[PDB]
Structures are given as structure tokens and as C-alpha cells.
């Protein structure tokens, strides 16, 4: 049978030392009391303002509201995509920055989680240095695998959330968060967790734990680590890759701050603006109007264009507004940036329209035409499929169930009669005709 260990078992510590040596635990005692005060107050203040939300996530074709509710705080302009959902940071006061976008208390709370972020980073570097020293018995690889750019805050009150699946392999009881890896992190990057609980026969049901197992493996007993108020733990190096973890609910409300190094090479505002500019290079930009005319109709430039159009629409606008407008509750940092990405995308609807006009044109040899179609067709079919997916996802029986405060908005969205927009929202007819054309004979 499947079993787990806790500090109650003699094997616990040796199983820890032998098969989870990259799991580190620093009890509340190792953390200054003033930091405990500022951090716990910050949690409570964010909860009081209604800043944490359950996400209407997606999993294997199903829309599911997270039991846990969350907020993501970190570097400005930075995102973190988990479960096909792109969380946008409410910014913290990282250097050379200013946020008139957040509220006094909320801004102070992000300040605090910045302080906590710095603290944990220092501990993580210390621990990775110790780890390397044991082994063999770069400095910059360590620096970068501890360089937390975000933190995902969690809240769950099990008493007002009586809907928890049981741990299915080791009898660890009730799961606030089931077995998973933390995804979309920088390779071998550490993860640090601050745990704030509002304080026989296996683990204690009343007390929050984090569960650990080896991937693919349910014969090796799992480890259930008890978490008391202010305990921190670190997942080092490849632990998050080779092991899975879950969060086992106790009986009392609990917050957590999960600091991570998000892989954001295609996940920052700067990055997505730069891609937009790149696409608009193919556009004569003397003036902003509806007479969009393109500098080139070379396949490669058109393919790239339609790809960037898809990127900004679906990984950026539809993601942001699917949660909308709940960010506005904590900050307005993303208000202008999202307006601007919407205007760039509008232009791109324009570009696509120039391309269609060009393919449906008199003096154009069918060879060049077919070149263009093969270059853009994949992108338009993906655009249609992803629009159906987002519209439907915006209308799930469960989507239309949570507060208007966070009802998904399907945006951008326009009716067939919408004269401001050059192309229909529904691309079915267009894609049909293009396919037909490429098959003539």
C-alpha cells in the first residue's frame, strides 16, 4: 500500500536526507519577527481589499475554478502563464520604477513582498552555495536561478471552501492543490515559499502540509512536511523537475507566498511591444488611418505579420480580458499598456485586410498568390479556431456564474454590422475561400 512519512517517523529524516536533499526547510524562527509582522499584515491587507481571486483555469478540455484564490505580484510588465492562463503582475516597487497605479495600502503590500522576495533570494543563494559545496566533495548560474521576478500568492479558507479532493496515493488527506510541478520556470530555478497559517496514524488533518513525491513513483513513500505560521521552504535545483508537490489543507485559513523565476522571454510587456513594432514595420506609417498599405508582400514578412497578430490577440488581449477587469481593482498599471496593444492589434486587423485585398487582385500571377496563401493560411486557421475557443470559454456555464467584478469579457469583440472593423470576427468564410483558391487547376 501507499504510505507517507512525517516527523513522527524515524525513517522520515533519513528518507529526507537520502531522496529529497534539495528540499530545504527554514522554520519561522530563522526569520526576523519584524519581517513576519510586515509580511502577515501585507497578506491580510490584500485579502481585506479583495485582491485575491480564484482563476477560471483550463485543464484537459475543461474549465475549472481553482479552489485556491490568488494574486500574482512582481516585476512590472512581467507575466506568468500557468494552466493556459496568463497572470499579469501587479507591480512591486522594483528600482527605477514608479507606480501611481496602485492604492496606498496595496502599494505598501507589494513593497513588503518585494522585501520578502529579496530576503528569500539571499537565503536561496546561500543554500545553493552550500549545496554545491557538499557536491564535488558558476556563481552566475546560481544568481540567475535564485533571481525571483514574481510571487504567486495563495489563499484558502477550508471552512468556507469545503470542496477538497483527497490525496489518492499515500493517504495524505485533503488537497488544497493537487500533485503538480510548478511550470514555466527557468530551468533548474529554485522556488521559495513563505507559509502563513492563521493559527496517531499519519499526518495531522488540522495542520497544513506540503506533500512531496518522486515523479512517476508511488511505491517510494511520500513526504508530508508540516507547515506552521511563518515556516519557509525552498525547492532547489532540479527538485521541481524530478519531484511533484501538492498542498495539503489543514482546518484553518492559510496564505502562501510562492516566489519563482518565471521564464519570460516571450512573457513581458517590453517583449510584446517589440514584436508589435516588428509587425508594423511592413506598414507605411506616415499617418494613422484606415488606408493601410503594406511595404512588402514577401511570404516570410506576411507570415511573420499574421503570427505576431495572433500572438498579441490571444496570448495578450484575450488572456487579460478573460480575467477582466479585476486587475483594475489592485492597480491600473496595465490599463494604458492594454489600450496600446489593442490599438496595435487593430492596425493588424488592417494589415490582414490589406493582404486579403492583395490576394484578391487582378494583376497578380497565381504563383505569387499561392505563395502568399501558403504563407498566411496556417495563421488565419489558428486565428479562427482560437477565437471559437475563447468565445466559448467566455460563455461557459461556470464563466457566467462568478461576480460581474470578474466576469470574463470576450474582448476584442465586434458584430458583423460593426463598420469600424475591416474584417469580420468570424473568419470561417474567408478561410474557406483561401483554401479553395490554393486548390485550383
- The residue ranges that bind ligand PD2 (CB under 6 A) are 154, 177, 182, 193, 195, 210, 245, 247, 256, 258
Residue 151 or 304 having the CB closest to Zn ion: 151
Handedness of CA 230, 231, 237, 243 (dihedral sign): negative
- State the nearest-atom distance from the C-beta of 154 to ligand PD2, in Å: 5
DSSP state of 283: B
* Phi, psi angle pair for 343, to nearest 5°: -70, -40
- Closest CB to Zn ion among 239 and 308? 239
CB-nearest residue to Zn ion: 182
Nearer to Zn ion, 261 or 380 (CB): 261
Distance CA(203)–CA(189), nearest Å, equals: 29
Q: How far apart are CA 166 and CA 4, in angstroms?
A: 14
Which partner in ligand PD2, Zn ion, none is near 154 (CB below 5 to 8 A by kind)? Answer: ligand PD2
Binding site: which residues? 70, 82, 154, 180-183, 233, 245, 254-256, 258, 260
* Phi, psi angles (nearest 5°) of residue 329: -70, -35
Q: Does 55 bind Zn ion (CB under 5 A)?
A: no
Interaction partner, residue 210 (Zn ion, ligand PD2, none; CB < 5-8 Å by kind): ligand PD2
Q: Which residues are annotated as a binding site for 2-oxoglutarate?
A: 154, 233, 254-256, 258, 260
User: And the C-alpha cell for 2?
Assistant: 501507499
Collect all residues with Cβ–Cβ distance below 8 Å to 77 and sequence separation of at least 6: 89, 91, 268, 269, 270, 337
CB-nearer residue toward Zn ion: 247 or 269:
247
Q: Which does 349 bind (CB under 5 to 8 A by kind): ligand PD2, Zn ion, none?
A: none
Give, as ranges, the residues between 153 and 212 that touch Zn ion (CB under 5 A): 182
Distance CA 322, CA 332 (A): 16
Smallest distance, Zn ion to C-beta of residue 245, A: 6
- Minimum CB separation of residue 185 from Zn ion in Å reads 10
Backbone angles phi, psi at 5, to 5 degrees: -125, 150
d(C-alpha 247, C-alpha 186), whole Å: 22
CB of 182 to ligand PD2, least distance (A): 5
- Rounded to a whole number of angstroms, the minimum distance from the CB of residue 26 to Zn ion is 18
Q: How far apart are CA 34 and CA 377, in angstroms?
A: 59
Q: Which does 193 bind (CB under 5 to 8 A by kind): ligand PD2, Zn ion, none?
A: ligand PD2
**Contacts of Zn ion in 328-357 (CB under 5 A):** none
Question: In this complex, which beta carbon is closest to ligand PD2, that of residue 54 or of residue 407?
Answer: 54
CA dihedral 343, 344, 346, 349 (to 10 degrees): 180
Q: CB-wise, 177 or 338, nearer to ligand PD2?
A: 177
**Given the complex with ligand PD2, which of 28 and 108 has the nearer CB atom?**
28
353: left (phi over 0), alpha (psi -120 to 50) or beta: alpha
Instruction: Tell me whether residue 184 or residue 251 sits nearer to Zn ion (CB atom).
Output: 184
Cα separation, 293 vs 353, in Å, equals 10
> H or E stretch including 234?
strand 232-235
Half-sphere exposure at residue 258, Cβ-oriented, CA atoms within 13 angstroms: 23
Residue 224: name its binding partner from Zn ion, ligand PD2, none (Cβ under 5 to 8 Å by kind).
none
* Smallest distance, Zn ion to C-beta of residue 218, A: 19
Q: Is 244 helix (H, G, I), strand (E, B) or coil?
A: strand
Beta carbon of residue 41, minimum distance to ligand PD2 (angstroms, whole number): 19
Helix, strand, coil in percent for the chain, rounding step 5: 40, 20, 40
- Min dist. Cβ of residue 35 to ligand PD2 (A): 18
Residue closest to 430 by CA, chosen among 379, 391, 393: 379
Q: Which of residues 62-91 bind Zn ion (CB under 5 A)?
A: none
Site for Zn ion in 407-426 (CB under 5 A): none
Residue at shortest CB range from ligand PD2 = 256
Applying CB under 5 A, which residues contact Zn ion?
Answer: 182
Amino acid at each position: 500500500r501507499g504510505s507517507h512519512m512525517t516527523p513522527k517517523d524515524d525513517e522520515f529524516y533519513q528518507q529526507w536526507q537520502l531522496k529529497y536533499p534539495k528540499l530545504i526547510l527554514r522554520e519561522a524562527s530563522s526569520v526576523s519577527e519584524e519581517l513576519h509582522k510586515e509580511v502577515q499584515e501585507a497578506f491580510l491587507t490584500l485579502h481585506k481589499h479583495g485582491c485575491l481571486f480564484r482563476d477560471l483555469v483550463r485543464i484537459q478540455g475543461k474549465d475549472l475554478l481553482t479552489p485556491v484564490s490568488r494574486i500574482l505580484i512582481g516585476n512590472p510588465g512581467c507575466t506568468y502563464k500557468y494552466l493556459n492562463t496568463r497572470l499579469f503582475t501587479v507591480p512591486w516597487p522594483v528600482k527605477g520604477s514608479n507606480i501611481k497605479h496602485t492604492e496606498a495600502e496595496i502599494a505598501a503590500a507589494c513593497e513588503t513582498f518585494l522585501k520578502l522576495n529579496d530576503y528569500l533570494q539571499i537565503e536561496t543563494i546561500q543554500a545553493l552555495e552550500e549545496l554545491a559545496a557538499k557536491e564535488k566533495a558558476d556563481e552566475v548560474d546560481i544568481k540567475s536561478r535564485a533571481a525571483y521576478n514574481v510571487t504567486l500568492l495563495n489563499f484558502m479558507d477550508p471552512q468556507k471552501m469545503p470542496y477538497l479532493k483527497e490525496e489518492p496515493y499515500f493517504g495524505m488527506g485533503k488537497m488544497a492543490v493537487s500533485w503538480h510541478h510548478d511550470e514555466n520556470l527557468v530551468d533548474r530555478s529554485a522556488v521559495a515559499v513563505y507559509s502563513y497559517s492563521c493559527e496517531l496514524e499519519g499526518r495531522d488533518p488540522d495542520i497544513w502540509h506540503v506533500g512531496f513525491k518522486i515523479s512517476w513513483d508511488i511505491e517510494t513513500p511520500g513526504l508530508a512536511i508540516p507547515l506552521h505560521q511563518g515556516d519557509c521552504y525552498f525547492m532547489l535545483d532540479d527538485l521541481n523537475a524530478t519531484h511533484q508537490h501538492c498542498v495539503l489543507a489543514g482546518s484553518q485559513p492559510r496564505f502562501s507566498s510562492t516566489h519563482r523565476v518565471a521564464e519570460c522571454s516571450t512573457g513581458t510587456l517590453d517583449y510584446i511591444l517589440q514584436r508589435c513594432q516588428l509587425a508594423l514595420q511592413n506598414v507605411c506609417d506616415d499617418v494613422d488611418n484606415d488606408d493601410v498599405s503594406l511595404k512588402s508582400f514577401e511570404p516570410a514578412v506576411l507570415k511573420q505579420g499574421e503570427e505576431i497578430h495572433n500572438e498579441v490577440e490571444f496570448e495578450w488581449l484575450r488572456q487579460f480580458w478573460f480575467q477582466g477587469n479585476r486587475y483594475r481593482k489592485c492597480t491600473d498599471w496595465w490599463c494604458q499598456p492594454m489600450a496600446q496593444l489593442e490599438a496595435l492589434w487593430k492596425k493588424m486587423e488592417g494589415v490582414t485586410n490589406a493582404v486579403l485585398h492583395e490576394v484578391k487582385r487582378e494583376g497578380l500571377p497565381v504563383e505569387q498568390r499561392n505563395e502568399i496563401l501558403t504563407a498566411i493560411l496556417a495563421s488565419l486557421t489558428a486565428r479562427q479556431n482560437l477565437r471559437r475557443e475563447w468565445h466559448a470559454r467566455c460563455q461557459s456555464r461556470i464563466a457566467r456564474t462568478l461576480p460581474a467584478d470578474q466576469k470574463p469579457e470576450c474582448r476584442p469583440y465586434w458584430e458583423k454590422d460593426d463598420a469600424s472593423m475591416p474584417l469580420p470576427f468570424d473568419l470561417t468564410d474567408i478561410v474557406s475561400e483561401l483554401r479553395g483558391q490554393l486548390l485550383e487547376a
